[PDB]
Amino acid sequence: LNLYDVLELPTYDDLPQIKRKYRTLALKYHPDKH
Amino acid sequence: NELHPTLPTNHNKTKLLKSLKNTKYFQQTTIDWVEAGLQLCRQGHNMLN
Amino acid sequence: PLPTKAEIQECTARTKSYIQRLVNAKLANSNNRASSRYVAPANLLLNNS
Amino acid sequence: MPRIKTRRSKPAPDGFEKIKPTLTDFEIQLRDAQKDKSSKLAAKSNEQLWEIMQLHHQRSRYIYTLYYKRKAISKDLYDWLIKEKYADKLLIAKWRKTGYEKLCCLRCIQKNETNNGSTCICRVPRAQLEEEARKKGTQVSFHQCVHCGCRGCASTD
Amino acid sequence: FTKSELKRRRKTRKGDGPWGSWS
Amino acid sequence: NEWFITGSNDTTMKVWDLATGKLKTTLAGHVMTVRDVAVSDRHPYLFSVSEDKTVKCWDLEKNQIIRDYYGHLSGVRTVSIHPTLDLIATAGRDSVIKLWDMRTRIPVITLVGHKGPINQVQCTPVDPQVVSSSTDATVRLWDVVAGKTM
Amino acid sequence: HRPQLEARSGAKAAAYTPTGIEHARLLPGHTTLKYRK
Amino acid sequence: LYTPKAEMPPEHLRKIINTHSDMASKMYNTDKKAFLGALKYLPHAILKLLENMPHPWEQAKEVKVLYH
Amino acid sequence: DDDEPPLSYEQHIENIEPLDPINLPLDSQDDEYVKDWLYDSRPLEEDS
Amino acid sequence: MTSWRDKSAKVQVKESELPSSIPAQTGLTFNIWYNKWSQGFAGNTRFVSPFALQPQLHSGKTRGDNDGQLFFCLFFAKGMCCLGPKCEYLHHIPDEEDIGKLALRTEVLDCFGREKFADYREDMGGIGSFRKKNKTLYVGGIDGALNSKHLKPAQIESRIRFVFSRLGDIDRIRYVESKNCGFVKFKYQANAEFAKEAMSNQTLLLPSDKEWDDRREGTGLLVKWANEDPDPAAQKRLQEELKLESLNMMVHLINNNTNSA
RNA sequence: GGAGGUCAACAUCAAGAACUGUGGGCCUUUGCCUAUAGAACUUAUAACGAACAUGGUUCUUGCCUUUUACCAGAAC
Ligand SMILES: [Mg+2]
Ligand SMILES: [Zn+2]
Ligand SMILES: [Zn+2]
Ligand SMILES: [Zn+2]
Ligand SMILES: [Zn+2]
Numbered sequence: 001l002n003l004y005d006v007l008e009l010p011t012y013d014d015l016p017q018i019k020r021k022y023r024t025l026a027l028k029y030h031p032d033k034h
Numbered sequence: 035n036e037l038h039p040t041l042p043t044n045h046n047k048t049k050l051l052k053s054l055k056n057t058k059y060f061q062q063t064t065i066d067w068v069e070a071g072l073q074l075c076r077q078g079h080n081m082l083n
Numbered sequence: 084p085l086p087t088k089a090e091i092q093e094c095t096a097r098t099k100s101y102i103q104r105l106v107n108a109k110l111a112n113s114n115n116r117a118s119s120r121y122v123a124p125a126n127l128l129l130n131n132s
Numbered sequence: 133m134p135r136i137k138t139r140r141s142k143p144a145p146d147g148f149e150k151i152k153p154t155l156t157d158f159e160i161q162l163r164d165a166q167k168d169k170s171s172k173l174a175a176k177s178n179e180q181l182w183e184i185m186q187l188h189h190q191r192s193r194y195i196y197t198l199y200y201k202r203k204a205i206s207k208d209l210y211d212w213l214i215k216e217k218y219a220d221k222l223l224i225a226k227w228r229k230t231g232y233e234k235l236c237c238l239r240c241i242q243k244n245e246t247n248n249g250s251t252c253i254c255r256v257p258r259a260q261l262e263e264e265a266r267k268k269g270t271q272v273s274f275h276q277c278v279h280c281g282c283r284g285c286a287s288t289d
Numbered sequence: 290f291t292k293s294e295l296k297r298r299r300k301t302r303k304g305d306g307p308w309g310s311w312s
Numbered sequence: 313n314e315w316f317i318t319g320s321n322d323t324t325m326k327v328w329d330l331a332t333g334k335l336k337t338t339l340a341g342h343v344m345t346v347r348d349v350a351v352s353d354r355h356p357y358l359f360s361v362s363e364d365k366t367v368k369c370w371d372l373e374k375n376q377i378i379r380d381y382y383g384h385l386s387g388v389r390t391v392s393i394h395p396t397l398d399l400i401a402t403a404g405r406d407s408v409i410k411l412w413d414m415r416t417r418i419p420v421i422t423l424v425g426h427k428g429p430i431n432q433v434q435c436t437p438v439d440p441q442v443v444s445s446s447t448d449a450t451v452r453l454w455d456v457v458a459g460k461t462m
Numbered sequence: 463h464r465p466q467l468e469a470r471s472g473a474k475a476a477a478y479t480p481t482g483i484e485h486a487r488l489l490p491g492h493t494t495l496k497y498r499k
Numbered sequence: 500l501y502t503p504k505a506e507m508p509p510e511h512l513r514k515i516i517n518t519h520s521d522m523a524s525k526m527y528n529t530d531k532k533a534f535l536g537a538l539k540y541l542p543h544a545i546l547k548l549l550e551n552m553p554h555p556w557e558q559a560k561e562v563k564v565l566y567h
Numbered sequence: 568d569d570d571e572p573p574l575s576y577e578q579h580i581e582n583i584e585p586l587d588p589i590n591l592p593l594d595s596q597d598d599e600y601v602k603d604w605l606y607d608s609r610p611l612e613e614d615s
Numbered sequence: 616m617t618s619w620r621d622k623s624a625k626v627q628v629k630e631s632e633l634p635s636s637i638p639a640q641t642g643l644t645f646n647i648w649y650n651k652w653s654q655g656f657a658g659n660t661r662f663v664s665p666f667a668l669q670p671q672l673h674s675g676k677t678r679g680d681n682d683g684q685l686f687f688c689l690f691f692a693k694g695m696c697c698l699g700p701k702c703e704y705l706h707h708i709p710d711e712e713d714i715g716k717l718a719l720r721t722e723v724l725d726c727f728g729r730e731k732f733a734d735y736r737e738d739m740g741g742i743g744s745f746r747k748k749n750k751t752l753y754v755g756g757i758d759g760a761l762n763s764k765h766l767k768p769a770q771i772e773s774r775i776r777f778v779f780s781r782l783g784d785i786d787r788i789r790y791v792e793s794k795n796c797g798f799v800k801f802k803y804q805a806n807a808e809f810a811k812e813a814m815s816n817q818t819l820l821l822p823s824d825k826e827w828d829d830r831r832e833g834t835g836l837l838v839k840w841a842n843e844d845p846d847p848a849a850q851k852r853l854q855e856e857l858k859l860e861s862l863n864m865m866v867h868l869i870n871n872n873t874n875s876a
Numbered sequence: 877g878g879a880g881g882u883c884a885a886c887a888u889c890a891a892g893a894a895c896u897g898u899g900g901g902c903c904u905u906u907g908c909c910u911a912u913a914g915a916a917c918u919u920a921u922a923a924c925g926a927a928c929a930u931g932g933u934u935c936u937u938g939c940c941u942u943u944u945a946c947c948a949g950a951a952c
Binding site: 352353354355356357371373378379380382384385386398405406407408410414415416417422424429 | 469470471472473475476487488490491492493494495496497498
């Protein structure tokens with residue numbers, strides 16, 4: 001399973017984009033909520 | 035008839051009558067055979083008329 | 084982007100189920116006791132009173 | 133085995149003759165029931181049928197009283213009757229059961245045929261229908277089981 | 290209801306059992 | 313990638329080898345010209361379709377017609393095989409797109425829409441599952457479950 | 463009063479009520495698919 | 500549930516058909532529809548009847564019919 | 568004949584007695600085992 | 616009460632007496648499915664009823680009463696009912712109470728328990744519409760009186776009044792001299808239906824007058840549903856009635872609407 | 877509780893000469909190897925039926941004005 005597959009996300013992202021990806025996922029799959 | 039077999043149909047287990055008798059509308063009895071022949075002739079004749 | 088993966092495993096699911104509902108809805112309609120082998124109160128009326 | 137006197141049929145047992153007249157009065161009436169007395173109205177038709185069912189009931193009740201009440205006949209005469217279709221084996225067997233002593237028919241206890249639930253109102257004691265009637269004060273609308281013509285099979289009434 | 294009440298009560302029906310008409 | 317299937321205007325279909333270009337076999341069976349041919353991924357099936365109003369399946373194993381789908385009013389110019397559903401999509405001068413159930417040969421869904429003949433049809437796994445193009449100079453993106461233009 | 467000038471839209475036939483006659487060629491046949499590997 | 504079928508007097512059947520012989524009333528409007536339907540099942544009834552022929556040594560067979 | 572309606576079983580036929588069938592004389596001595604039940608409708612119904 | 620309520624209904628006609636089916640020889644051969652005749656067309660088939668009712672004489676209690684059925688026996692309305700007190704439906708002329716019971720279901724279907732159709736009928740035939748409450752019967756084919764010509768229209772008028780008058784509460788009646796038609800109007804839709812089915816195909820004058828014993832050869836009188844009234848007067852009268860009644864139900868609307876809040 | 881029933885429902889009946897459960901080891905559930913228990917019915921001149929009908933499509937024919945109805949072989 002890819003890291004992209006694990007997050008169920010699509011495949012040169014910036015360090016900023018990396019942060020934003022986590023933030024987006026956090027909103028969706030927040031462990032404290034789900 | 036020996037050369038070309040058929041090898042019937044499992045799930046055929048459902049038959050016309052077993053399905054038919056189930057309903058309100060069919061009732062069972064005995065009767066003399068000749069009488070069933072005559073009834074069936076009258077049945078048929080009414081049907082085609 | 085092409086449409087991921089676990090997105091198509093959804094559309095395929097719901098569409099597949101829907102088409103099955105149509106087909107099975109048809110095969111139980113038509114005149115064959117044969118064709119049916121290839122196949123709730125549900126009403127809260129008004130205020131449900 | 134058949135009603136007919138076909139050569140295979142074994143001759144009557146001993147006690148038969150005494151009861152032959154009583155049975156013949158039933159037979160001669162069934163002749164008159166199926167003669168096709170014509171009627172326009174539905175009610176009258178299924179009334180005609182009710183005649184037949186009730187006659188059948190009465191005959192089998194006669195024999196049942198002979199063997200299982202008075203014991204006025206032998207076992208062999210009885211079995212010979214059943215094999216000759218003067219009686220209804222299954223129906224009698226219901227009569228021997230606890231709750232069914234007065235029963236109409238075997239249709240009236242059919243659970244499957246009737247739409248919801250089962251067992252014609254033909255089987256429900258008047259004692260009760262008078263009570264649910266009493267709640268409405270509409271009296272009671274029931275008269276005849278459509279299959280039979282029964283009014284209260286239930287063995288209390 | 291009571292057994293005596295029923296036994297007495299039924300003979301009211303016109304014709305024995307069970308085709309006998311209540312009323 | 314071992315071969316072609318090529319329609320023709322002579323009614324045949326000739327299966328050519330891609331490597332050397334030699335001719336493997338010929339599949340006859342249509343009485344008029346064959347407008348479209350489509351081969352399946354998941355299945356060993358070949359769906360051909362023609363101007364004779366008929367969509368014929370072909371079993372690649374035995375090379376014989378298996379099924380006929382029925383119900384177009386007139387010549388059927390396009391077949392496309394839905395990727396994941398075991399469906400066919402056919403279309404032609406009917407001016408409607410017929411979604412065929414591959415197994416039972418039942419024209420399950422019909423897509424009313426274009427005001428003229430339908431030239432070319434495609435299938436996609438997610439939404440719009442059918443794209444269509446017609447001589448009314450439009451291209452519609454269909455939603456099949458609801459059965460109307462997305 | 464001759465030729466086609468148009469074709470019949472299947473749309474029309476889509477709105478009619480079904481008859482339910484049973485044809486000979488829709489009787490069940492080749493009732494099982496085949497999947498490739 | 501499932502109580503088996505209820506066997507009935509033959510006189511009953513004889514009365515049913517014996518009645519429907521003449522039908523002109525309006526009360527028959529379903530039964531008429533009912534006849535044409537059964538036209539589809541007849542040849543089956545012809546089979547089941549004709550395979551039960553009584554054979555020479557028997558005088559009269561007696562069978563179980565299922566009637567509408 | 569075509570004009571004669573089929574005669575009703577509940578009247579003409581049912582009263583009139585069956586008039587013996589084929590059978591065979593058999594033999595008393597040789598067939599002693601099978602003489603009895605051979606021509607029954609269903610040959611053996613009640614036997615354990 | 617003293618008349619109808621106590622005295623149980625009496626069989627009008629013995630079942631053996633009822634007319635046979637298979638009406639007579641309108642054509643060459645009989646047809647089994649539809650009940651009519653085959654080839655050729657005989658002179659048009661219509662005939663006076665051998666039967667009629669007698670409101671106080673026949674009508675009486677029946678089983679529906681105890682069973683609380685809503686709907687009236689039409690074979691009673693034709694006085695042809697052979698089931699007598701055994702009948703499933705009510706035998707008596709509709710009153711205001713019973714219409715009170717029907718009031719919910721009188722919208723879709725007539726008093727006899729038959730669904731109404733939408734459009735009436737080409738000739739204004741048997742049963743009405745559920746669009747329009749129509750209380751007005753057209754009486755026509757007045758030659759149901761056969762060929763006797765009468766001293767005045769007060770003969771026709773008077774006789775009709777005494778006919779329908781029994782069948783229910785009449786709001787008005789007008790015979791027309793020029794074109795032979797009566798127009799009769801009732802309080803209630805129900806009585807209109809009942810009277811229509813009651814008096815269709817009937818005869819006239821006295822239990823015995825003149826040609827009376829030949830009455831059965833007559834054609835019998837059409838009772839059909841009546842069109843609107845073209846004259847301005849009654850048109851005003853309708854418009855007003857509709858107005859005041861609309862006004863009357865606005866009271867209900869504001870009472871239960873006021874309860875809605 | 878025993879015998880039955882021209883009673884019903886639900887399972888199963890054409891295949892690596894072929895079934896299922898369980899114990900243990902390896903890979904990482906599947907799958908392979910090893911150990912153990914039980915296998916009704918149907919099969920070798922092969923099959924549930926010691927019997928034997930029809931229909932559809934596709935080819936080849938045969939009658940032969942054309943369609944139904946057909947002639948007699950094959951494959952599915
Ligand atoms: Mg031609
Ligand atoms: Zn009963
Ligand atoms: Zn009952
Ligand atoms: Zn009863
Ligand atoms: Zn009545």
